Design an enzyme around this catalytic site. Sequence first.
Site, PDB file in Angstrom:
ATOM      1  N   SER B 140      60.771  86.379  83.740  1.00  0.00           N
ATOM      2  CA  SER B 140      60.455  85.983  82.420  1.00  0.00           C
ATOM      3  C   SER B 140      60.123  84.885  81.717  1.00  0.00           C
ATOM      4  CB  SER B 140      60.571  87.404  81.481  1.00  0.00           C
ATOM      5  OG  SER B 140      61.300  86.804  80.332  1.00  0.00           O
ATOM      6  N   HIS B 327      55.871  94.378  83.046  1.00  0.00           N
ATOM      7  CA  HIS B 327      57.009  93.079  83.255  1.00  0.00           C
ATOM      8  C   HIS B 327      57.889  92.900  82.987  1.00  0.00           C
ATOM      9  CE1 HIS B 327      57.578  89.068  81.439  1.00  0.00           C
ATOM     10  NE2 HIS B 327      59.128  89.136  81.613  1.00  0.00           N
TER      11      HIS B 327
END
Lengths: 348, 347
Positions: B140, B327
């Site tokens: 991320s 995610h």
Amino acid sequence: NRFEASLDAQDIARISLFTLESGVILRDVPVAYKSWGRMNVSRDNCVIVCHTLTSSAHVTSWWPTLFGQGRAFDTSRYFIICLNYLGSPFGSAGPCSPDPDAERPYGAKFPRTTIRDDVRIHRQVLDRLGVRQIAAVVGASMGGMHTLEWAFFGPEYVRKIVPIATSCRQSGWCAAWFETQRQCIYDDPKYLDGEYDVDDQPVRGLETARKIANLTYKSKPAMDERFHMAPGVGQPIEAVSSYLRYQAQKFAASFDANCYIAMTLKFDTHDISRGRAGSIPEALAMITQPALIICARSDGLYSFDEHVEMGRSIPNSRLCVVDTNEGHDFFVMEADKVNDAVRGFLDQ
Amino acid sequence: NRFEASLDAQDIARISLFTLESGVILRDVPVAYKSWGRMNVSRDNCVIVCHTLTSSAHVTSWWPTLFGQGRAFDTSRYFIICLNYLGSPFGSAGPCSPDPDARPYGAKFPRTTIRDDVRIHRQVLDRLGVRQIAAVVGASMGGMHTLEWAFFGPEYVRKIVPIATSCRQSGWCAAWFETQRQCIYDDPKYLDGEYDVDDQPVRGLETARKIANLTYKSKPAMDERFHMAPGVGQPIEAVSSYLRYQAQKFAASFDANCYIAMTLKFDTHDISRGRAGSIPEALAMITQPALIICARSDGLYSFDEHVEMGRSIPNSRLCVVDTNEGHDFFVMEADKVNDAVRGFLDQ
């Protein structure tokens, strides 16, 4: 009740005894509703519109372009009615309404109600108004859950259904989102186990809950169009802060915490198959009416795939995919497209 | 600093003067880092791993299976190093570290950017004597640093592996992270950042982290984990404490001001600012081989934007992990990420 008081005029039916499916008996139960148009002689031109989590029975205020001559909710052809859900602050029995066993409002002690409880009491109200047949039920989000439930009355009473942006059963995903939201309220020191004073609400919990909810109703593309950075070498990213605060503050100023809890908990009871069938597909196949399922690809709460599943198992169903990038919101942001779809379907 | 104190041993470099791109000068700046393996004679077998928002430099603690002989971060072949970001509670300069002008920086720690971290990190690497970087790998927030490292050029940075990330801050993510920070701002214990370190705004922090944790998930993944009994933990009842549990642990062991500082970093991210007129034009300045790793149901950093990366980065391969995770995936599916990274590092 300040929340109900802020509304335009509406009708109240009172049901003297109502048995919730839990077995709890409600007494002297108000059910608020609003209707537009007139019943025909045959009393079979009724269209039921099921409202959304935090809305009132006044559908015209968020779906105004669905109403009028030539529109979906054509007041020249139909008797359109929307009835307020139990648990809501807008007129039907809920935390904000008087408790007949202490009269003081129910407050934090309002019993648990289910989607099926609302459908049952609302149909009692329709029986009183003298409705003999339903031309269609139409509802989005939470209202598409009621819509699916209305269908089980059978095709002789409920002729067609339009479930929009919704599910057949509670999901882990949405349970988690709404529980998160409820926990914001539970953790506000102003909540006091639901015993707060009505004009000293847990405002920060409610805001935070609403901010979360409001973003789950959006999409990535939609928020990206609305807020972005200047080119390399409101709209700016700086403006996000107050966008988030603004509409969340408005909501907290004008909704009740205990009703938010009561309404969202309704979501957890939803399952069109419980007591009826061994799976969702088998319960869907018991829906015999024509159905128009309306959805968007980028609804982040109620998935494209689960709408496809509805269309697969409801025998006389058509799937309508709205051409949009707007998220769960779409049925409001793209009202004209929903109107055309609904109207086309109602004309067949 | 109780946060730093709870870690295994690590190194600290001290940069006596560092100019942030704002123009603010940081003084006597600790940069914390952790390495594994040995540099070769040529000093060109360095792999940089860029960590995630709330993590320390100790990558082994959330990516343990990426380490070891035959694995991606092969300590027999490479000198693997992860440096701690500015703003973090885990060793580098941040709200929790001593203020040279006073007592910790607290709420007065300057804005730092992704580019600031890359610059001070690279100064540390220069001191370590790194002559070339074999690969930069990160996901991320780390994928953002990864993309920025690439701008040093293909002579210094040979390959990049950006994972589950973006080229620029988006309205979507800014809204999510600002919502999270507002939870902290509204906790009466926050005290405009002047709270006592052992009386944190714990409720703000929990709430910010519940939200974050769900945005890291997907609908299918949550649907598998919690569902309703058939028609006529795992139950929906169990969601309540699932949400509390890990969020409570985090709030007990992270700093509020750091959460703010770190997430605000996301707002400064744009590989194109000062360099080019659009994102596609900046991506085309990335000359290294790149492996872009993503998942279809990442709800923060979209499939489509990774496809755009692959389209504009001239020597890139897109790797779509076969998973239903969100995610999260780069951690839930560590073995798949390992295989992809390793296969790329072997080319």
